[PDB]
Amino acid sequence: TNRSTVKISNVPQTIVADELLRFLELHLGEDTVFALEIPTTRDNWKPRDFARVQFTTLEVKSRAQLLSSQSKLLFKTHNLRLSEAYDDIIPRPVDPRKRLDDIVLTVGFPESDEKRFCALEKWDGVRCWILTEKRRVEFWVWESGDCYKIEVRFEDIIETLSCCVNGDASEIDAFLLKLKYGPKVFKRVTDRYRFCKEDFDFMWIRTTDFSGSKSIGTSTCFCLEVHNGSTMLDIFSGLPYYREDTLSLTYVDGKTFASAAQIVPLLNAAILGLEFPYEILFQLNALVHAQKISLFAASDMELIKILRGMSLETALVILKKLHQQSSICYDPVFFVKTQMASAYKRLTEQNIMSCQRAYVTPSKIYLLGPELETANYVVKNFAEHVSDFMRVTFVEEDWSKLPANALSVNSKEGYFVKPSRTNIYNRVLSILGEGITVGPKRFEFLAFSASQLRGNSVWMFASNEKVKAEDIREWMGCFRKIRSISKCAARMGQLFSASRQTLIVRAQDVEQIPDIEVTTDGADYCFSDGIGKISLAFAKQVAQKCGLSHVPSAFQIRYGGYKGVIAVDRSSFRKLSLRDSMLKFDSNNRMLNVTRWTESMPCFLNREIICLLSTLGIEDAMFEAMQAVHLSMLGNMLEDRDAALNVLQKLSGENSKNLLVKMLLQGYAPSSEPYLSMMLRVHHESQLSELKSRCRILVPKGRILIGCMDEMGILEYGQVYVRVTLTKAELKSRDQSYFRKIDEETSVVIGKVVVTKNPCLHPGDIRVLDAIYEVHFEEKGYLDCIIFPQKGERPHPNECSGGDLDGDQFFVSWDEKIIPSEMDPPMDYAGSRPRLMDHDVTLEEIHKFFVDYMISDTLGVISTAHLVHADRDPEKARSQKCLELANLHSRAVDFAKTGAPAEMPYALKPREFPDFLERFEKPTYISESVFGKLYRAVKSSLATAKAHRDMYGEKLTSLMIYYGAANEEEILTGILKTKEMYLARDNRRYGDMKDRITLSVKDLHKEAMGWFEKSCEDEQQKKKLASAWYYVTYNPNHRDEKLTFLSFPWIV
């Protein structure tokens, strides 16, 4: 009953669409059939056995269903059987009242504070269809012959208002549609078995704005001119957030605000014609982009005159105060009337920089503003032009990832299928070429990192007289030696990861040592991919500036274009050693920096590991018991203080000091201390939500750490050394058969430990390794580093889906319950042939590669399809389908380095989803595998002082309202219980936002610590004042009418 389209089961093959249409119109009412379509296996001469018919009204559909149920439809000795259809032939509403023809369409924004509306462009005779089922509204506009489709979703419109144009308050002749996001724009492009009753034989492709003045791009509101429409209020009442009030508007001549440039919603620079600062102008433009202040309301002469002469700090404060409020401000002039060095040290202490972030959409551009975030290596030596750096990402109108159909839609022309680029493709190319011009600046493309390529983000630097983009590019290094487009871009964007500064190393303390390579069975296997050596004095010198007490045995490092992990050796000559197969490109500088040294984090059992371990013989009883005991331990964590400390000391951080951790061992009852109680509750909720989203089993007998190889040659093929730190469980009972107590803090393992990488889709990745204890190896002093053998047939990293020694973590677990009997050879790691050009890169082919990475990017769907297929058929990860999926996944993960598309087949798509998925719209099927059992189990289980305090509360509220947080716990922990439509799809952006908010709150805590230190500066008196602050924040009588937060004194 949802839709009027009905699928006919069996029809004769000899019939045509006209005969069936005549039969239906004879049995049913006259011309009651709208669309009739018979699919054809061939082009135009081999129709199928079924057909789909769309009726004009639901009553006709019900009558046809009743006739079919009574077997009263006999067409050429065939009894037609009617059934529901998956989708309609034409997206057309059933109700004739919703269909609106010949109505005037205009666009604009609330230019004035009063009830005044400005019209940018007016379209006459447009078609408006309201689709309640699709939750969207279609607008058909005919301009210069070819028509365009404008789709507005229900989420796009934030409020519905009714207005009048004739001038009568009683009459309702207009409707205002306040749109938050931009609307999709389509374009029409140019029969025996298709009646269709009309000329609907075309296709829709997404295109950019078709307006000459780009009115749609700069308009955030839509007005629908209509007749009196007394009964139209009921139809318009279905729109979300409808206002049942009568309002009148006044048309204002706003045809002057028309920009022919690609970037529409930016303010004009020639209007100012003065020395206005760039930062204030950027803040104002970002405010205009947000749904706070309209363009015309911020383009007045009075506002710019007032803001031109004023103190910079107060201007920024009032601007951020105006931006922080959720309510729309109509008259910012009245608001601002009623309202009335460090960068370098921040970079040195925590690498804190204010980076401008920009969002490029097909309709308009969104500027986030000077958001604080971590810093890369480039800004270390380019810390003068902080505002010149801008992060630019390409997303859709809803700030989601651009679909593959929006760029280069496929079309069959001639003998073969030739893709045709859409207007969005050309728009992206033009934006990358010309650049973004914001105020007195123009941003040019520098490079994109490896992570930014997946996220469709890029860095842009504004050219200046002292330094330009080409100057920075040539300072980073010479990339003309690379003849591969993907490789050159990867190398150029490689030196953009966050790292901590240290001492500078000269070029005279270098050496070249031979590597090792063995060729067996005609396969080139290289052991030394990114390995290196380091001395003890150099390790101490490097660790001094980052504050490391224990010297790590291995740490990921990169300098001068080199990249790889280096191990500590006790027989080194000098402080530095270099190998051969490490130089990616020749760099002009040799600055040293490190990213991460070592972490003894306990390992977890992800979905892939459990999926590949359900074949060797591991039964579901062990997994169910482990999940049940984990849930039992987590449930008692709330009411038991002993369980909380054990959980915190064995799940996140082996040796971590925190305020909650210190009070967990010694504290009051869980009922008391609401500040810690709410944090414990939200942590439990986050853990259970993460368990529901994905399988993350907490195991105490496993860790994750990087591994290296030593120049000993004593370990044979399959023999390694396992060493890790001692946790609470290990210290409580260290007497075990597979555990050797070599030291108080470090315990050696003698059990059978397997190694696996984070991505794994092949049964051959599992390899059983026996741990061996040797005095000679222990004499070198290795810790938190798996010792890979130097000699052998094939290297161990190659066994784990062709891994390399570039500081990547490894999965190690000294568990004796696994089944080591079954062994499967791993898949080959031979990649595709590199593509070498005959000429140098002209800076355009790299842009083409970057844009073409958006299309044919099936990295995320291959893993889901593999999981679904393994869930469906028995003997998973053994059939040829799983092997093909693993090969496709390897080819897709090699896309970032070599320009080879994955080419995901259509027949390999899952089309079905288990219960443990967030795709509620997609069909959900009951799963009976181990993951289904885990999901069922978890479902069953779940079923002076005052001034500082006020300032801290104001800062916290400002941060919460800027980031959308409504509670203290969700902004302190960094996890948001509510998310937008795009944040819930991909986890990379959500993780980036969580890291940013964590950095912001840590900066606020540091500022509060500095204020506390400056306030008193006397240790005993500081303790007394802290006790007084705790007393004054604990007394309920001292809290005022405002929302007083109790997280201010809790700093240590």
Binding site: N10, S69, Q70, S71, L74, T77, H78, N79, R81
Partner: protein
């Protein structure tokens, strides 16, 4: 004398043609017993339409109290055939002179049927 007796409702017809002039295999699902049946019925001589309800009976002999190999008046679609395959939710394969019958139900519902025995097929459409 009647081994299996139940009420069946036809679900669909494989040819689904009024004037196909061919044997039409009917699919019927039992009521209160949940048994699926395949039967080849000549629609032209004995018309059956989707949604109709009919009773079905199976007896080794049509005589009263013995005399294997007078229920003719009660029913109207008598047939004679033999059961040749009992392999399975056990199912039966009875051929009425080349007209195959597939009665799929439960192991307890159909258990008194022997291999290579002659059985009749009584059917009345109420």
């Amino acid at each position: 004398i009647i081994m299996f007796e139940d009420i069946f409702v036809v679900d669909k017809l494989d040819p689904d043609g009024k004037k196909f002039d061919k044997v039409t295999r009917v699919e019927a699902r039992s009521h209160n017993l949940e048994m699926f049946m395949h039967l080849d019925v000549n629609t032209e001589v004995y018309p059956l339409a989707v949604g109709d309800k009919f009773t079905l009976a199976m007896a080794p002999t049509l005589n009263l109290d013995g005399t294997p190999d007078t229920l003719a008046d009660k029913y109207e679609y008598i047939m004679h055939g033999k059961l040749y395959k009992i392999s399975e939710k056990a199912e039966l394969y009875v051929s009425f002179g080349g007209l195959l019958m597939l009665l799929q139900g439960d192991p307890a519902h159909i258990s008194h049927f022997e291999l290579d025995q002659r059985l009749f097929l009584l059917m009345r459409k109420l």
